[PDB]
Amino acid sequence: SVVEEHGQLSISNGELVNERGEQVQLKGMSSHGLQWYGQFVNYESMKWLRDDWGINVFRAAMYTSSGGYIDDPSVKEKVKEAVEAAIDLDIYVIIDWHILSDNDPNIYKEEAKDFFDEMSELYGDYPNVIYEIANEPNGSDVTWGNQIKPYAEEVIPIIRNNDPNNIIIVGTGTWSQDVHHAADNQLADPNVMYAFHFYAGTHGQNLRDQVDYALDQGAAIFVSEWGTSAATGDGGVFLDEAQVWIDFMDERNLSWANWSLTHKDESSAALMPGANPTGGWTEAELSPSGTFVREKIRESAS
């Protein structure tokens, strides 16, 4: 029903919109690294998230480094399984080339172009798909102008050869925080969005105002990853400031995906250790973070 209602997504003056120009706000979950916690990504768990949480988007976080796709490309099958599940379930799906320790997106540019050529040929005709070409560029010598924009300028045409219209989300500097630099030197492709990521126990008003700057320049922003914890993961969850951010995103209709769907023992994890991989979770199988995120997604779901 989600993709059935909205169909093809596009950007209109910085806003994510459906095929009739109506605002669309996607809320869902991100997987943790598919090379570590791939058992939580399957048709049953995505159905349970769709039906019980009300998600309308699922993000497949394909790490490149850290035992991910570069060393073992069999993780692509997990990405495929997620995409095909999303298509069956009628929800949107984000294919995320999850760089992090490989902080400059150009480190694996050739591989990224090959990977996105393959994904876009297989799935380009479905409106469900969203590409995220560089999770979190980071480092003082990784900038929008020198490193990230030019990367996007090479990868985007590769996807566009096969898929002329699906949304492409492009990471920004400082772990996808530097949306204002990107907004002052935007890509030309009309269906692009810039990533903005945050952690409720670490980031506040200063980054909120930076996001407002970017939006004021006409740039579209997709909060493709955010955590309820501190970036450090100490002190537990910070749901007070997480709720300020929730309202911030709602005021501006920003789409988001929470990090992350795993049973790992870290505050941002949505599930408790031992939680069922195929969903159907009791309330005891959800962490404090998961309980809160589920509530945020349910209360806006139809």
Ligand X SMILES: CO[C@@H]1O[C@H](CO)[C@@H](O[C@@H]2O[C@H](CO)[C@@H](S[C@H]3O[C@H](CO)[C@@H](S[C@@H]4O[C@H](CO)[C@@H](O)[C@H](O)[C@H]4O)[C@H](O)[C@H]3O)[C@H](O)[C@H]2O)[C@H](O)[C@H]1O
Active-site residues, by number, are 136, 225
Q: Nearer Cβ to ligand X, position 136 or 241?
A: 136
Q: Binding segment for Ca ion among 81-89, 111-119, 243-251, 262-270 (CB under 5 A)?
A: 111-119
Chain positions 232 to 291 lying near ligand X, rule: CB under 6 A, are 264, 266, 268
Q: Binding segment for Ca ion among 48-56, 86-94, 166-174, 234-242 (CB under 5 A)?
A: 166-174
What Å distances lie between residue 224 and 162, 169, 256, 261, CA to CA? 23, 8, 5, 14
Q: Give residue 263's region: left, alpha or beta (phi > 0; psi -120 to 50).
A: alpha
Q: Could you say whether residue 175 binds ligand X (CB under 6 A)?
A: yes
The residue number whose beta carbon is nearest to ligand X equals: 175
Q: Could you say whether residue 27 binds ligand X (CB under 6 A)?
A: no
226 among the known binding-site residues? no
Q: Could you say whether residue 166 binds Ca ion (CB under 5 A)?
A: yes
Q: Which does 268 bind (CB under 5 to 8 A by kind): Ca ion, ligand X, none?
A: ligand X
Q: How far is the CB of 161 from ligand X (least distance, A)?
A: 31
Mask for 67-86, x = binds Ca ion (CB under 5 A):
-----x--------------
Q: How far is the CB of 244 from ligand X (least distance, A)?
A: 17
Give dist(CA 299, CA 88) in Å, integer.
24
Q: Could you say whether residue 116 binds ligand X (CB under 6 A)?
A: no
Q: Nearer Cβ to ligand X, position 9 or 75?
A: 75
| Tokens, residue 217 | 């320049």
Question: Which chain residues interact with Ca ion by CB under 5 A?
Answer: 72, 117, 124, 163, 165-166
Question: Which chain residues interact with ligand X by CB under 6 A?
Answer: 36, 66, 100, 136, 175, 199, 231, 264, 266, 268
Binding residues for substrate, as ranges, are 32, 36-37, 63, 98, 199, 231-232, 259, 264-266
Binding residues, as ranges, are 32, 36-37, 63, 98, 199, 231-232, 259, 264-266
